[model samples]
Target: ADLPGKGITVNPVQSTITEETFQTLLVSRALEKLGYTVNKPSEVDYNVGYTSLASGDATFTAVNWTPLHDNMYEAAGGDKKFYREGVFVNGAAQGYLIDKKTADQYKITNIAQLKDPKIAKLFDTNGDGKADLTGCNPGWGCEGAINHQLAAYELTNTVTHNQGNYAAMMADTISRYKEGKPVFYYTWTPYWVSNELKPGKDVVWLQVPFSALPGDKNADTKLPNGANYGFPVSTMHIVANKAWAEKNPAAAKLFAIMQLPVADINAQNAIMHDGKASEGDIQGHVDGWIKAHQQQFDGWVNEALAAQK
Candidate 1:
């Protein structure tokens, strides 16, 4: 009858992006099974989330992107107070994409081609005589990469990095896609956009002339299959406060063992995107997923239980 986390509280943190809610709740459920008193999650962007965790204001968050969030991690006390473990979620290939119709019709494949005014005019949504790329919000790791690449690739003159409420901006981008208009956007995987605009079919990923990213992120954007998405392939992990995890081996092991299926996350995001995304709805999604993969879920729980010994 040993509960490793019998009375301790776990205040999870996450980005304001609703899709991230699924991952946060999943982690909370695992901690609850380990007897941790899981509280409702607190919403914050990647930058602030790291700060809050390192400060011990929030216990943990299920969404942390390696390389993508490296800058934010180091800025917020890094390994000194932040404890990030195994890859909880994968399939985060951040890059630019164009409608397959647009790419094929214009024989466009690389983002460098947009440097041409004639090619750039094809995706000009606001009539600025420049390509409009639906981009990441401020403070998001992707935003830094997008902004830097726009300049590094020398396409800032031909392309405009439009940013705002991502959901609202994406609504416009998707509508343009459905209407058979040329569309360009910045996106990553384990997201619902892939459902609506199937890559290689409805849209094709755009490669850059060469690898380019912000700060010390100089990893080659090239893939083994010869496709370069122009950004690091990211792995999402569960990050907890270093002091908190150091004192709670059960929670620490659970965070390390819990893994998220890419398809499941994408499917859940699809449901969330379709408007069944209230707080209760997300809890239901987490519950169903835990049940659907009960054995795998219990294996991690059992592993955590053993870790406490």
Candidate 2:
């Protein structure tokens, strides 16, 4: 956390009251005991400033994906320091999805050809003459990037963007697929989006034609690319307020050290989404993950200790 003058603070948002919240707060409590105060972001002196404008009270945020948070960072003034903590969800490695029959008949492999004007027009549900883009929620960093990409490609006229409740959108997506319809939306990997909407088989990850890297690209590197020119995204990041970081550098350091495995995060997220897991269940999952990966925790903490010396 850059202390320009003041200090840092923990995430100042109201955590959802669930096992997920319990575990996250538990972790926050542990950090607090280590000499930091975890407060709501509104109580901090720093701003997370996802876009270019830095908040005097903003500090940090959990992992924001590339192309998404990158846009926000630039909008906030391109500080670059926000992402220095870690590489989470490198590049947003997402793709277009088509039902199997569509791929087989259309032989659509790349997203380049989809701009033909005639392809997605038929799928325009609102009859806007453009295709319906089931995009991210409004005001989200990722949503901004998606909008930017549309403008960058001049697809505003070619595609109609739909902004709705995410869960409802996804639930609608599932309904569309069940009806043997062509489903196209932006989604990420390891998310229930991919888990429930399997790629390559159930859904194909259609490639984006151009190279667009949001400052928020993951993997501690520039933009990533796959074998087919796609790139791997980054792991998630732990963020808080600047006041929190300055007040408890040790806790801040611990936050930096407490990088959990993506697999663990995904599993817990899946459980939470599936309803089989409660907030407490999620906490239990975190505790189990911590216990299971105790060695990794020890290594991270010990390394921080070593740095202090």
Best-fitting candidate, scored by lDDT: 1
Candidate-wise lDDT, in order: 0.88, 0.54
All candidates: CA RMSD in angstroms?
A: 1.3, 5.8
Q: What's model 2's lDDT at 200?
A: 62
Sliding window of 10 residues with minimal summed lDDT for model 2: 44-53
Against the true structure, what is each candidate's TM-score? 0.96, 0.75
Give the alpha carbon lDDT tens digit for every residue of 1-309 in model 2: 322212324543322213124335434544444434566333211123442113434445554445445555455655433323654323335545665656666776755545767776645666666777777766555566567567755677777667866657978977888887776677764455666777667767666556554453342222444433233453445554444455455555665666544555556667777885654575577577767877876665555444441
Q: Model 1, range 175-246, lDDT digits (tens) per residue?
A: 988999999998888888888888889999888887877777556777787778787667899989999999
The clash tally of candidate 1 reads 0
Model 1: runs farther than 4 Å from truth? none
Candidate 2: segments with Cα more than 4 A from true spot: 1-9, 12-60, 77-83, 88-92, 213-232, 240-244, 305-309
